[PDB]
């Protein structure tokens, strides 16, 4: 890992080009080069390369993964002066608090919202139950009502948690490992409605992030569920869109998992002081955050002074309203195993491989024990191997 | 020819100078699969110029050359999203003759199928638009032409490859080929004609047969229910007979093992009752299946997918056919002389199969133990005698045979 440089990793759906602008300004004043990269499977790649002493100088991700990173000794302690800590909201400082120690700099609050096409759908629905009727009315013009990423549980979880589903119960001022609400009556009811949309052919089980984004941004589907990072591509497209509150399931609000984008410093980095100056004096300023927000919107930024310039944005207001009706993600190391189990459960329930009760039952056991059922059936291995044997021509 | 220069010719260039620019780029990069990140935006600009004319419609003069440039650029992840639009995928499907909506140039068809294979393989958006466009309908039909078709081997192979990619990646297309299009009957016919009873399968027929097997695996691995009718049973039995021929057949180019593996994997999806054709004493097929499995026991990282299908097939043959059960018992579990050496020690077949009974993978444990169990005629003390109690305990516990 090079010294005298700063290598930064941030997810590919974020403003990595905007972050490169902040690195240019950093090189202009100090003469230090800054490289921004967005590798695939970033949340898995960083543990494997940082545990060996490599990886980036600074790692960007939502706060939920940073506890497992800190528990493995992968993150260095950050030392923001009390004068700097007051420039950011305290609630975002909470999200990067692991064992009473600050492990990452918070950047911005994220939450899913209902994005809709004002031309195809001037009055967006307020409940999930009317979406089947709405998709019926929209199929008459070659369009559909709703499409969103069904390959990541983050996007399904708002419907799951609405009626009572939860991750780890917060009690006695702590998350307890063994209280998991993945297979209760509410999470079963939410996942069942999701599966019933797919059986009734209002949504396709194979829809991923890029398929959903492509459909909405080309005016094919009237609604999509996504976060602040997705507004730029909809701006660039010919779609006239609004960002509103998520629909209500069973008369209750959808509860999205609120994430706080955070920048962690690598323990193996020999530039822990340059990383501090870049994140405090360049990124977490009005100039640094605007450069990134101009690329892909961040949401409600942690820096007080610049959140004031964005708060009137009706899209930020809808992001916060959904954030208020949701739950701040835990950052316990068990979160990594929690997402792995719920990802398998959503896919299996949607694809019809398991029932709703089966998929959530297996996810509860794995999430309650911080274990990963790395199974894969024989027929699934054969297809994945036949696919892997196919190359380009 | 650099990407920026070739893109310049397409914009401000005469007909004869834009074709040479593409002609030279196709020569320099006909085998380019890695791309320099420096000229990334140059290639994306060139790719958007190629797609604009493709969406408008290419004149028949410059069609093979235009598609080859698109096929080369489709190998790059950065230029990928430029080619994955409805109009673009509709143009490629029309030029390939598989659009649902003019004579066909066989070179244009070949290049269009290759383009479609690249985009479908690489892009979920392309997979989604290909499902919407219903390409599988005309694809299966042309594949179903069989001896009625003078289509070249290349076109027939890339139809199957595109058929494999759609059915592997898209479950809606996979179910559409199985249910609406009756793909099992369609591909069983296509398999029957690709095989001809030659004692050696030529290289071309070997490629298409194995694609047919992999497509058949995609549409049968989780769609065939336990109880079928006699039409499906006669259909699956007939398909099983062709798989019996593959198991007994040799393939040119040292690909006989690759063909057998796909044949065995597809056998593992058929209804268990349809495996009787493997026997119609006469244990030539079982002997080949047994040594097929015996050679697969060396796989470590991919042991599961290598031995579970054939073991499951051997287990069902032994369970329903007494001469097969007894023949396999004589081959796998010969009568013991000295009962001192532990079953899980040694390099004999019985020793390799016993060690799998305590494998880490629960599928390998069940499949290996079930095999030796039925060879012991489901007798608990006979099962313990040959495999040892500690190794036998897993199966006996799962089946509630302790009491
Ligand atoms: O799907 C599970 C996934 O959810 C969250 O990931 C979000 C991320 O927070 C967003 O900023 C954006 O990148 O979308 C992601 C979902 O694809 C968790 O942060 C992540 O740990 C978890 O695996």
- Classified as helix, coil or strand, B143 is helix
CA distance A302 to B306: 53
- The token duo for B250 is 């040799």
d(CA B401, CA B389): 13
Q: How far is the CA of A359 from the centre of ligand 1 (A)?
A: 20
Q: Chain B residues with CB inside 8 Å of A237's CB?
A: none
Mutate to test the pocket of ligand 1, among A9, A11, A67, A154 (most ligand atoms within 8 A of CB): A154
Which of A293, A300, A322 shows the shortest CA–CA distance to A91? A300
Q: In Å, how far is A138's CA from the nearest CA of chain B?
A: 16
CA A320 from centre of chain:
15
**d(Cα B8, Cα A303) in Å, to the nearest integer?**
46
Read off the DSSP letter of residue B273: G
Closest CA to B274 of B244, B248, B294: B244
Q: Which residues of B touch A387 (CB under 8 A)?
A: 165, 168-169
**A299, A306 in Cβ contact below 8 A?**
no
Asked whether the beta carbons of B55 and B91 are under 8 A apart, the reply is yes
3-state secondary structure of B250: strand
Q: CA–CA separation, A135 vs A156, rounded Å?
A: 18
Could you report how far apart the first and last alpha carbons of chain B are, in Å? Answer: 79
| Inter-chain touch B172–A214, beta carbons under 8 Å | no
Report how far apart, in Å, the C-alpha atoms of B266 and of each of A23, A40, A77 are. 55, 34, 55
Q: Which residues pair with A115 in a beta bridge?
A: A224, A243
* Distance of residue A166 Cα from the nearest chain B Cα, in angstroms: 30
| A238 interface with B at CB cutoff 8 Å | no
Q: Where are the alpha helices (DSSP H) in B170-321?
A: 171-178, 183-195, 203-220, 230-248, 256-267, 284-296, 303-320
B251 SS3 class: strand
Lookup: tokens for B297: 């026991």
User: What SS3 string covers chain A?
Assistant: CCCCCEEEECCCCCCHHHHHHHHHHHHHHHCCCEEEECCCCHHHHHHHHHCCCCCCCEEEEEHHHHHHHHHCCCECCCCCCHHHHCCECHHHHHHCEECCEECEEEEEEECCEEEEECCCCCCCCCECCCHHHHHHHHHHHCCEEECCCCCCHHHHHHHHHCCCCEEEEEECCEEEEEEEECCCHHHHHHHHHHHHHHHCCCCCCCCCHHHHHHHHHCCCEEEEEECHHHHHHHHHCCCCEEEECCCEECCEECCCEEEEEEEEEECCCCCHHHHHHHHHHHHCCHHHHHHHHHHCCCCEECEHHHHHHHCCCHHHHHHHHHHHCCEECCCCCCHHHHHHHHHHHHHHHHHCCCCHHHHHHHHHHHHHCCCCCCCCCHHHHHHHHHHHCCCCC
**Chain A residues with CB inside 8 Å of B128's CB?**
204, 206-207, 211, 214-215
How far apart CA B129 and CA A293 sit, in angstroms, is 32
CA distance linking residue A197 with residue A225, whole number of Å: 15
Please, which residues have CB within 8 angstroms of residue B207's CB and are 6 or more apart in sequence? B153, B157
Which among B135, B50, B60 has a CA at the least distance from the CA of B94?
Answer: B135
Cα A299 off chain centre by: 12
Task: Give the residue, by CA position, lying nearest to ligand 1 atom 22.
Answer: A339
The secondary structure of A200-216, three-state, reads: CCCCCCCCCHHHHHHHH
Structure determined by:
X-ray
Instruction: Identify the helix (H) or strand (E) that includes residue B132.
Output: helix B124-133
Minimum-distance CB partner of B71 among A205, A386, A393: A393
Residues followed by a break in chain B, C–N over 2.5 Å?
101, 196, 280
Q: What is the DSSP string of B85-114?
A: SHHHHHHHHHHHT--------HHHHHHHHH
A248 vs A269: CA distance, rounded Å:
46
Q: Ligand 1: which residues within 6 Å by Cβ?
A: A 11, 13, 43, 62, 64-65, 110, 152-154, 259, 339
Q: Which helix (H) or strand (E) holds B161?
A: helix B153-169
Q: Which two tokens stand for residue B274?
A: 């349809």
All structural domains of chain A, each given as residue ranges with its CATH number in brackets, are 6-110+258-311 (3.40.190.10), 113-255+331-388 (3.40.190.10)
| Nearest CA-CA distance, residue A15 and chain B, Å | 17
**DSSP code for B217:** H
Domain residue limits at B85: 3-399
* DSSP type of residue B201: E
Contacts (Cβ under 8 Å, ≥6 apart) of A200: A132
Using alpha carbons, select from A43, A215, A222, A239 the residue that is nearest to residue B124.
A215
End-to-end distance of chain A based on CA atoms, in angstroms? 36
Phi, psi of A265 (to 5 degrees): -100, 135
In 10 A of CB B130, how many CB atoms? 27
Structure tokens at B347: 């390099």
CA nearest to A375 within chain B: B361
> How far apart are the CA of B334 and the nearest CA of chain A, in angstroms?
29
Q: A210 and B125 in contact (C-beta within 8 Å)? A: yes
Strands A327-328 and A257-265: parallel
Q: Quote the Cα angle for A92-A22-A298, to 5°.
A: 40
CATH code (residue B360)? 1.25.10.10
Q: Encode burial over B302-320: b for 16+ CB neighbours within 10 A, e otherwise.
A: ebbbbbbbbbbbbbbbbbe
Q: Which residues pair with B302 in a beta bridge?
A: none
Number of domains chain B contains: 1
- Do residues A67 and A98 lie in contact, with contact meaning Cβ atoms separated by under 8 Å? yes
Q: Which residue reads 């069942």 in tokens?
A: A192
Question: DSSP assignment of B42-71, as one string?
Answer: HHHHHHHHHHHHHHH---GGGHHHHHHHHH
Radius of gyration of chain B from Cα atoms? Answer: 26
Please answer whether residues A23 and A34 qualify as being in contact, where contact means their C-beta atoms are separated by less than 8 angstroms: yes
> In whole angstroms, what is the distance from residue A242 CA to residue A120 CA?
11
Environment class of A160 (CB within 10 Å of its CB; exposed 0-12, middle 13-18, buried 19+): buried
A381 chain-B contacts, CB cut-off 8 A: 302, 304-305
Q: What values do phi and psi take at A334, rounded to 5? A: -70, -10
Burial of A141 (0-12, 13-18, 19+ CB in 10 A): exposed
Which residues of chain B are within 8 Å of residue A148 when distances are taken between CB atoms? none
Angle made by CA atoms B16, B22, B25, in degrees to the nearest 5: 140
Q: Which residues contact B11 (CB under 8 A, 6 or more apart)?
A: B49
Chain B interface, best mutation among A201, A349, A379, by max B CB count within 10 A: A379
Show which of residues 128-187 on chain B sit within 8 Å of chain A, judged by CB atoms.
128, 131, 161, 164-165, 168-172
Residue A208 touches partner B, C-beta closer than 8 Å = yes
What's the token pair of residue B367? 């499949």
Q: How far apart are CA B53 and CA B345, in angstroms?
A: 68
The three-state secondary structure class of B200 is strand
Q: Which two tokens stand for residue B182?
A: 């009756």
**Could you tell me which of B88, B16, B75, B23 has the C-alpha nearest to residue B49?**
B88
Nearest to B54 by CA among B36, B44, B68: B68
* Six-digit token string for A29: 């004043």
Specified resolution (Å): 2.5
Give the integer Cα–Cα distance in Å for B285 and A298.
64
Query: B250 CB contacts (<8 Å, ≥6 apart)?
Result: B199, B200, B201, B256
**A232 burial type by CB count under 10 A (0-12 exposed, 13-18 middle, 19+ buried):** middle
* Spacing, Cα A369 to ligand 1 middle (Å): 22
Burial of A90 (0-12, 13-18, 19+ CB in 10 A): exposed
B171 closest CB neighbour out of A211, A351, A393: A351
The pair of three-digit structure tokens given for residue A96, joined into one six-digit string: 């990067």
CB-CB neighbours of A209 under 10 Å: 18
Question: What is d(CA A371, CA A338) in angstroms, rounded to the nearest whole number?
Answer: 9
Distances (CA, A) of A270 to A2, A262, A287, B41, B227: 8, 20, 26, 34, 65
- SS3 call for B233: helix
**Residue A112 dihedral angles phi and psi, to the nearest 5°:** -70, 150
């Amino acid at each position: 890992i090079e010294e005298g440089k700063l290598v930064i990793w941030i997810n590919g759906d974020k403003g990595y080009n905007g972050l490169a602008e902040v690195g240019k300004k950093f090189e202009k004043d100090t003469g230090i080069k800054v490289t921004v990269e967005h590798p695939d499977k970033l949340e898995e790649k960083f543990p494997q390369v940082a545990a060996t002493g490599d990886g980036p100088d600074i790692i960007f991700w939502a706060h939920d993964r940073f506890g497992g990173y800190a528990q493995s000794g992968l993150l260095a302690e950050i030392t923001p002066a009390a004068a700097f800590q007051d420039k950011l909201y305290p609630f975002t400082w909470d999200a990067v608090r692991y064992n009473g120690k600050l492990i990452a700099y918070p950047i911005a609050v994220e939450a899913l919202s209902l994005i809709y096409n004002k031309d195809l759908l001037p009055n967006p629905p307020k409940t999930w139950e009317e979406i089947p009727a709405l998709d019926k009315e929209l199929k008459a013009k070659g369009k559909s009502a709703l499409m969103f990423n069904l390959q990541e549980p983050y996007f399904t979880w708002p419907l799951i948690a609405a009626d009572g589903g939860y991750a780890f119960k917060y009690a006695a001022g702590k998350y307890d490992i063994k209280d998991v609400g993945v297979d209760n009556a509410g999470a079963k009811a939410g996942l069942t409605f999701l599966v019933d949309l797919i059986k009734n052919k209002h949504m396709n089980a194979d829809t991923d992030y890029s398929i959903a984004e492509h459909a909405f941004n080309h005016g094919e589907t009237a609604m999509t569920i996504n976060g602040p990072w997705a507004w730029s591509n909809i701006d660039t497209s010919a779609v006239n869109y609004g960002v509103t509150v998520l629909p209500t399931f069973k008369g209750q609000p959808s509860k999205p998992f609120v994430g706080v984008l955070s920048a962690g410093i690598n323990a193996a980095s020999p530039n822990k002081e340059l990383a501090k100056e870049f994140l405090e004096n360049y990124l977490l300023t009005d100039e640094g955050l605007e450069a990134v927000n101009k690329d892909k919107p961040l949401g409600a930024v942690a820096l007080k002074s610049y959140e004031e310039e964005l708060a009137k944005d009706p899209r930020i207001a809808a992001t916060m309203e959904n954030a208020q009706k949701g739950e701040i993600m835990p950052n316990i190391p068990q979160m990594s195993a929690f997402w792995y189990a719920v990802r398998t459960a959503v896919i299996n329930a949607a694809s019809g491989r398991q029932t709703v009760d089966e998929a959530l039952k297996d996810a509860q056991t794995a999430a309650a024990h911080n274990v990963k059922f790395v199974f894969d059936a024989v027929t699934d291995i054969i297809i994945k191997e036949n696919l892997k044997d196919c190359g380009l021509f | 020819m650099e990407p920026r220069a070739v893109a310049d010719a397409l914009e401000t260039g005469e007909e004869d100078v834009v074709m040479e620019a593409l002609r030279a780029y196709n020569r320099e990069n006909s085998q380019s699969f890695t791309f320099d990140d420096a000229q990334q935006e140059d290639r994306k600009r060139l790719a958007k110029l190629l797609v604009s004319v493709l969406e408008q419609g290419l004149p028949p003069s410059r069609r093979v050359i235009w598609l080859q440039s698109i096929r080369i650029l489709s190998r790059d992840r950065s230029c990928l999203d430029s080619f994955t639009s409805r109009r673009s995928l509709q143009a490629l499907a029309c030029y390939a003759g598989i659009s649902a909506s003019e004579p066909l140039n066989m070179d244009v068809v070949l290049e269009s199928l290759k383009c479609l294979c690249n985009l479908v393989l690489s892009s979920p958006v392309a997979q989604a638009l290909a499902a919407e466009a219903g390409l599988v309908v005309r694809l299966a039909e042309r594949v179903g032409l069989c001896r009625q078709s003078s289509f070249p081997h290349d076109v027939q192979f890339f139809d199957l490859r595109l058929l494999f990619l759609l059915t592997a990646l898209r479950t809606d297309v996979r179910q559409q080929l199985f249910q609406e299009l009756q793909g099992v009957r369609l591909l069983t016919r296509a398999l029957e004609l690709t095989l001809g009873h030659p004692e050696l399968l030529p290289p071309q027929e070997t490629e298409r047969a194995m694609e047919i097997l992999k497509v058949l695996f995609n549409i049968t691995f989780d769609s065939i229910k336990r109880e079928v009718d006699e039409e499906d049973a006669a259909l699956y039995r007939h398909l099983g007979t062709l798989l019996r021929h593959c198991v007994m057949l040799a393939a040119a180019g040292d690909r006989t093992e690759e063909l057998h593996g796909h044949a065995v994997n597809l056998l593992g999806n058929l209804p268990v009752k349809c495996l009787d054709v493997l026997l119609t004493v006469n244990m030539d097929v079982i002997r080949v299946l047994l040594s097929f499995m015996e050679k697969r026991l060396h796989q470590t990282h991919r042991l599961k997918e290598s031995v579970a299908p054939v073991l499951s097939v051997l287990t069902e043959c032994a369970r329903m056919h007494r001469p097969a059960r007894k023949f396999l018992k004589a081959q796998v579990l010969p009568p013991l002389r000295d009962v001192r050496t532990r079953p899980e020690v040694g390099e004999l077949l019985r020793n390799k199969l016993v060690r799998l009974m305590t494998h880490l993978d629960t599928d390998v444990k069940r499949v290996a133990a079930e095999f030796l169990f039925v060879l012991c005629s489901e007798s608990v003390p006979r099962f313990i005698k040959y495999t040892g109690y500690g190794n036998a305990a897993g199966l006996l516990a799962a089946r509630g045979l302790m009491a």
